Design a protein around this nucleic acid. Structure first.
Lengths: 34, 62, 225, 124, 216, 109, 4, 128
RNA sequence: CGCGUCCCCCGCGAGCGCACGGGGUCGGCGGCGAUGUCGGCUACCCACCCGACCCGUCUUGAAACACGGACCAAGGAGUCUA
RNA sequence: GAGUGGCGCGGACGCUACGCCGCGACGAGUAGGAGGGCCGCUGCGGUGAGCCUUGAAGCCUAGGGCGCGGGCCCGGGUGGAG
């Protein structure tokens, strides 16, 4: 049963990490623009 | 390609009495029903023994 | 009356539903407990190796408790002692697999069949795929597929292995009831390695596949599972 | 008894008919007409027989009585039902269910009587 | 009595709801929504009044019956099947109908119908192709799209509209419905130059043209 | 007005050196000469067009003499744009090195 | 009983 | 018109050819009836390649479609009208067949009675 | 995720509905149909592709440059008694 | 389990028990052994209110089929008494 919980947690963590990676790319672009 | 010896696969017990006499065959039908539907092991032995040959069920004297 | 017997038959039907749901939450929380164990097992192995290298000393990790032994060579032209050891490991057919715990008594059995096996120390995910997909149970001397939790519980419940995750735990973490859990599993009917073997005849050290493959059995488990 | 004179009749009866990997029984009261312990119409105390009427239309219901079972003439009591396709099938359902008279033969008899009624029903 | 609210947890993955059943317990808020504990219609008939029985027992039984099947779960009819499209087929794209009597013709895509089939009208002026359906699988999506988005296709022309009745005579509603959408497309294909005769022109495989090489 | 199928050659059957399995055909599609380029033609319908003596009915209109055995490009073969196609009737080997048509219309573009 |  | 059976499956057959005897082609003395080759050097006995096939139990037809005609019924061999009222309650599964040496005048009743009881005959308009 | 109670720290809610859930269904379709076409795997003839030496026998080993056999019908060989 | 105290006349299939059914695993084979044959031949006791000059046996067949096979069933022709 715990499989569903583990999967859901993994998909949420993956989404959060991807959003963070996009944010970091945006910050690096801003530093280069400065 | 499995290394199993099929020498000892077919078990040589009996599943029915070789006798075609009906009265003994009507008794088997009555103990086939009891050997499986009672928790008893008496009815397992009595069923197994009805299948056996004349030499395997000898005359128990008085 | 039957006013009772309608209501009495419902209560017993209810009692067995809440008996399932109580067992069901246990199977979840036992599985969530294991997710903590495997995290704590995985991380302490890396942790010990860091406090070694910080000092400059060496952390030699524990010799593996558990192997996965795959038969690779055929049934024709096999020595009688080598026949006996393969069929004590339950490797009676080419590309059969079984879990073998390591000790002094079992490595000497795994060195005496080194041409005719491909063995090694399997991964946690390598144990997962083998027990879920290829996992079959020896229930009443019949290879019945592990499709429900009430097959392992039916057979291995007395050793408190009541679900698939308990069995995977018992295999990977070689517990006190590994024998009753490993012998419950039917020897895994693996397919031929998808991509090709290197060289069946020779040892893995001399560019072959025959014998020990320490972490490298996991590359071939997914090749075969 | 029923079970005894089955163990004789099962293989070596005159009504028995074996060919083309098929076994039947051409008995005057077998309905579904196969060699069976259930449907054999010589063996039991209770025997429902369904036949086409001596007239054109209608179905007879052959009821075997309680008393004379060693009495081949005074045994079978016959009743012809020349009614519609519903209340000929209904009469037979009422003769069996509501008399407790061999209720194994309750549906096997109605499929027959229907197929007799279907036979004596002209073609277009 | 309550109105059906829409599902509180969004679909994160197919099968897996985004919220766990402790988060979901407070989304529904079940800590305060807790709970405690035909046939024989008679008729007055002019020796009394009668009782009839609707669903009466049958007058013929066949000599043997097929036994009732097992219960499968995920086998819907075609009417309830999920309808699939491509990334290349969007409303206004030009399609090369491959298989029909209009084989090879560049035929203008209007919209997805309620049967998976593509409502297509390569203008009857040019392709000699009416209001007609095509199948996704029997059509190549060309990488050329007239900006159709500002059309008003008659909603009354549906899936039952194009389904064959049983020579064939045209009823004038099909001539009017063609003529209504005629005046919304031909004036929109001509916004792009050389596109008018391109739709009149056919698709062919000449010596050297191999479809695995042309991106189109 | 033009051709709506690609040129294929029924080169042989799916065969080892000393055993052929007739149910799977090998199709040499002209144009594709690697597994790089074989991606488009997988799952495509492929027809063996031949004509015989006696007339047979045609879907569309009047009975012709021309017939077909329909097929389906199953998956890629070898390393050089050769492809495996499995036909509903196992092809006659008179057609070895003859023209069968890899169609376009299980289309996925 | 503890759902009241 | 036709008497349709109760149920009509796909009758799958593992082999539709005959198991011709080894060297029934070379000789007229050797009949086309299969004999197991019991030679010490026989190609066909010890499964050589491109050879005459030996029948195994593995070629056995599906138990649900075994003895089943292409029409979907199984044959039953009928000599008189008395052997038709045996088939009237297996009407949908099994069909009648009238024996070779039943006379032309009696076939005229057996086919006429089998139509009354709605039983299929494999060879209805045989002699006439 | 109750309260009415039993300690060491601070025994049945009432329904619906959707379904990756103990093995396929479609509540979807379109074509051609009377001396010219429809199906018939089998069975007649034929062609192609791959495979394929001639059986019986004794033999360690037979396609053998081992022996029996031109061909066909009919007959023909573990019986009976103690 | 059971005691005694505090409107509708309705419900498919089945089970020749020597049958029916379910789940798992397995299948080379000379000499050789055993089993099962609703395989085949000829006579016998039974039995099929069997079949047959409105055409038995036989024999031929580019006919329809069936059985894994031994073989068998039909259609057509031929034939004249089982």
């Amino acid at each position: 049963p715990y499989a569903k919980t583990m999967r859901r947690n993994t998909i949420l963590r993956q989404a959060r990490n991807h959003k963070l990676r996009v944010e970091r790319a945006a910050a690096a672009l801003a530093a280069k623009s400065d | 390609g499995v290394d199993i010896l099929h020498n000892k696969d077919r078990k040589v017990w009996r599943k029915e009495p070789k006798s075609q006499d009906m009265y003994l065959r009507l008794l088997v039908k009555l103990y086939r029903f009891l050997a499986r539907h009672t928790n008893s092991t008496f009815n397992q032995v009595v069923l197994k023994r009805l299948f056996m040959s004349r030499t395997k069920r000898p005359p128990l004297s008085l | 009356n039957f006013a009772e017997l309608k209501i009495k038959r419902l209560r017993k039907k209810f009692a067995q539903k809440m008996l399932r749901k109580a067992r069901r939450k246990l199977i979840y929380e036992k599985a969530k407990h294991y997710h903590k164990e495997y995290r704590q097992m995985y991380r302490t192995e890396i942790r010990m190796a860091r406090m070694a290298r910080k000092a400059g000393n060496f952390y030699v990790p524990a010799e593996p408790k558990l192997a996965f032994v795959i038969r690779i060579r055929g049934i024709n032209g096999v020595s009688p002692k080598v026949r006996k050891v393969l069929q004590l490991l339950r490797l009676r057919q080419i590309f059969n697999g079984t879990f073998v715990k390591l000790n002094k008594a079992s490595i000497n059995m795994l060195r005496i069949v080194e041409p005719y096996i491909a063995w090694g120390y399997p991964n946690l995910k390598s144990v997962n795929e083998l027990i879920y997909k290829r996992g079959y149970g020896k229930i009443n001397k019949k290879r019945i597929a592990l499709t429900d939790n009430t097959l392992i519980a039916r057979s291995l419940g007395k050793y408190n292995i009541i679900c698939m995750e308990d069995l995977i735990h018992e295999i990977y973490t070689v517990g006190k009831h590994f024998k009753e859990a490993n012998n419950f599993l039917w020897p895994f009917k693996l397919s031929s390695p998808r991509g090709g073997m290197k060289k069946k005849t020779t040892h893995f050290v001399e560019g072959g596949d025959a014998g020990n493959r320490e972490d490298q059995i996991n590359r071939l488990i997914r090749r075969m599972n | 008894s029923a079970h005894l004179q089955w163990m004789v009749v099962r293989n070596c009866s005159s009504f028995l008919i074996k060919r083309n990997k098929q076994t039947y029984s051409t008995e005057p009261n077998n309905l579904k007409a196969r060699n069976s312990f259930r449907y054999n119409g010589l063996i039991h105390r209770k025997t429902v027989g369904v036949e086409p009427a001596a007239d054109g239309k209608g179905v007879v219901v052959v009821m075997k009585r309680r008393s004379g079972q060693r009495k081949p003439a005074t045994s079978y009591v016959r009743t012809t039902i020349n009614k519609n396709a519903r209340a000929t099938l209904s009469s037979i359902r009422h003769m069996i269910r509501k008399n407790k008279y061999h209720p194994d033969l309750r549906m096997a008899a109605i499929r027959r009587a229907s197929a007799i009624l279907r036979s004596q029903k002209p073609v277009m | 009595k309550g109105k059906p609210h829409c599902s509180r947890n969004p679909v994160l993955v197919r099968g897996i709801g985004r919220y766990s059943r402790s988060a979901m317990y407070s989304r529904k808020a079940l800590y305060k929504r807790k709970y405690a504990a035909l046939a024989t219609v008679t008729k007055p008939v002019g020796g009394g009044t009668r009782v009839v029985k609707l669903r009466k027992m049958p007058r013929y039984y066949p000599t043997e019956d097929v036994p009732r099947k097992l219960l499968s779960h995920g086998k819907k009819p075609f009417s309830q099947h999920v309808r699939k499209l491509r990334a290349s087929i969007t409303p206004g794209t030009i399609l090369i109908i491959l298989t029909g009597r209009h084989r090879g013709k560049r035929v203008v895509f209007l919209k997805q119908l309620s049967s998976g089939l593509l409502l297509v009208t390569g203008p009857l002026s040019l392709n000699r192709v009416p209001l007609r359906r095509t199948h996704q699988k029997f059509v190549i999506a060309t990488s050329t799209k007239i900006d159709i988005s500002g059309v008003k296709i008659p909603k009354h022309l549906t899936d039952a509209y194009f389904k064959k009745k049983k020579k064939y005579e045209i009823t004038e509603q099909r001539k009017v419905d063609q003529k209504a959408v005629d005046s919304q497309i031909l004036p929109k294909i001509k916004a792009v130059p050389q596109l008018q005769g391109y739709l009149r022109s056919v698709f062919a495989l000449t010596n050297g043209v191999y479809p695995h090489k042309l991106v189109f | 007005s033009g051709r709506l199928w690609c040129k294929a050659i029924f080169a042989g059957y799916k065969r080892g050196l000393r055993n052929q399995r007739e149910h799977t055909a090998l199709l040499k599609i002209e144009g594709v000469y690697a597994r790089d380029e074989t991606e488009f033609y997988l799952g495509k319908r492929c027809a063996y067009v031949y004509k015989a003596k006696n007339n047979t009915v045609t879907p569309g209109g009047k009975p012709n003499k021309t017939r077909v055995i329909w097929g389906k490009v199953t998956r890629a073969h070898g390393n050089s744009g050769m492809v495996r196609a499995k036909f509903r009737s196992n092809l006659p080997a008179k057609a070895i090195g003859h023209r069968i048509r890899v169609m376009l219309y299980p289309s996925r573009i | 009983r503890g759902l009241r | 018109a036709a008497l349709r059976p109760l149920v009509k499956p796909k009758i799958v057959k593992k082999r539709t050819k005959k198991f011709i005897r080894h060297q029934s082609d070379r000789y007229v003395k050797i009949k086309r009836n299969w004999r197991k080759p019991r030679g010490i050097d026989n190609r066909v006995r010890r499964r050589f390649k491109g050879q005459i096939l030996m029948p195994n139990i593995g070629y056995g037809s599906n138990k649900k479609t075994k003895h089943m005609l292409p029409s979907g019924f199984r044959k039953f061999l009928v000599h008189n009208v008395k052997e038709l009222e045996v088939l009237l309650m297996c009407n949908k599964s099994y069909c009648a067949e009238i024996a070779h040496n039943v006379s032309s005048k009696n076939r005229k009743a057996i086919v006429e009675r089998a139509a009354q009881l709605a039983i299929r005959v494999t060879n209805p308009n045989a002699r006439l």
